[PDB]
């Protein structure tokens, strides 16, 4: 069925992770589809089921493994498989409902959470904001383990939510943003974990609005400014696709 990109946190390097994110990006795109120089993800509408998802297999030094499912339209995690069991975030509608039934068809245990995978919800359940959750190879190593143990009852809900937040940001947000990909690279480089600062968070928050601004722009000029934050929380605006070329690697389809 769907394509699989493999990644292991064990002895992971900057090159190791960079090849992984490139590979991941490569599988989302491309229809040679570029608006104002930023690649655009496939349009949800009319998309055949078999082009809908990509799988990401993750494993750690303990040889524990899980597989994440990402929607090619938003590059967001919709759920995961570990062994006999598969879990899914709550679908926003029946179209997305039906869609996810094509994932992990062999898995003998299927579960769909009552809650979605949006940050607001996951932060509540984790007992922490993205601000207070650390990222890096270590946090990811653990997240894999936490998901693996979830079906046997070895993982507390807050720990699971926390583990989702780690995966989404280190995989989805990383694929969406070369800028976020780079922040992760640094953590791996120095073999340290840290929580993301406002510059990462406001980007994540604004991915949809930037997608719109860019695709609906005039010759690259934003109809209206998008305000972001710097590391110290100071606000600034983006008026043009130009400055975002090196920043954002992908966009959800708009128009």
């Amino acid at each position, epitope marked *: 069925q769907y394509p699989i990109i493999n990644f292991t946190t064990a002895g992971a390097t900057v090159q190791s992770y960079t090849n992984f994110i490139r590979a991941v990006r490569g599988r989302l795109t491309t229809g040679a589809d570029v608006r104002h120089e930023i690649p655009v993800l496939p349009n949800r509408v009319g998309l055949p089921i078999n082009q809908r998802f990509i799988l990401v297999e993750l494993s*750690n*030094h*303990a*040889e*524990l493994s899980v597989t994440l499912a990402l929607d090619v339209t938003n590059a967001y995690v919709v759920g995961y498989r570990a062994g006999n069991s598969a879990y899914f975030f709550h679908p926003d509608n029946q179209e997305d409902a039906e869609a996810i039934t094509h994932l992990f068809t062999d898995v003998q245990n299927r579960y769909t959470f009552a809650f979605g995978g949006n940050y607001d919800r996951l932060e509540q359940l984790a007992g922490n904001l993205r601000e207070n959750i650390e990222l*890096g*190879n*270590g*946090p990811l*190593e*653990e997240a*894999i*383990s*936490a998901l*693996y*143990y979830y079906s046997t*009852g*070895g*993982t*507390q809900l807050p*720990t699971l939510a926390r583990s989702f937040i780690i995966c989404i940001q280190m995989i989805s947000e990383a694929a969406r943003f070369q800028y976020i990909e780079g922040e992760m690279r640094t953590r791996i480089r120095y*073999n*340290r*974990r840290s929580a993301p600062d406002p510059s990462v968070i406001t980007l994540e928050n604004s991915w949809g609005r930037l997608s719109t601004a860019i695709q609906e722009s005039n010759q690259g000029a934003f109809a209206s400014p998008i305000q972001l934050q710097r590391r110290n929380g100071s606000k600034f605006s983006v008026y043009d696709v130009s400055i975002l070329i090196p920043i954002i690697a992908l966009m959800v389809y708009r128009c």
Partner: nanobody
Amino acid sequence: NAQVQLVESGGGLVQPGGSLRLSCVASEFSRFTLDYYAIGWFRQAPGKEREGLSSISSSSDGFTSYSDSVKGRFTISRDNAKNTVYLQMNSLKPEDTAVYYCAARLGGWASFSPQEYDYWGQGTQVTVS
């Protein structure tokens, strides 16, 4: 499987202000060595329930966690050649008195939750007077 036997030791009676060093020793011939494991340290008073104190992740970056109660007094550490993990309890005081436990999970993280480890030591009593 992940089967491993945890034999702890190093507990006992101590004068207030004193210090002790606990040991989680993983017995030989488990498929994986102890460095593949997260090790939690818990303590339980008779009328009370299990409580997480210090923890160390399986993660390669050596992440450790400490409850507010023991922070700066207690230090968790590894000796891999001995397949062992140490807990150094300093500046000890009577309130610390309780039975202490070591706990492990393969590829685990640093948790204060008993549900989040799969394997336990037999426990060792600590008393400060």
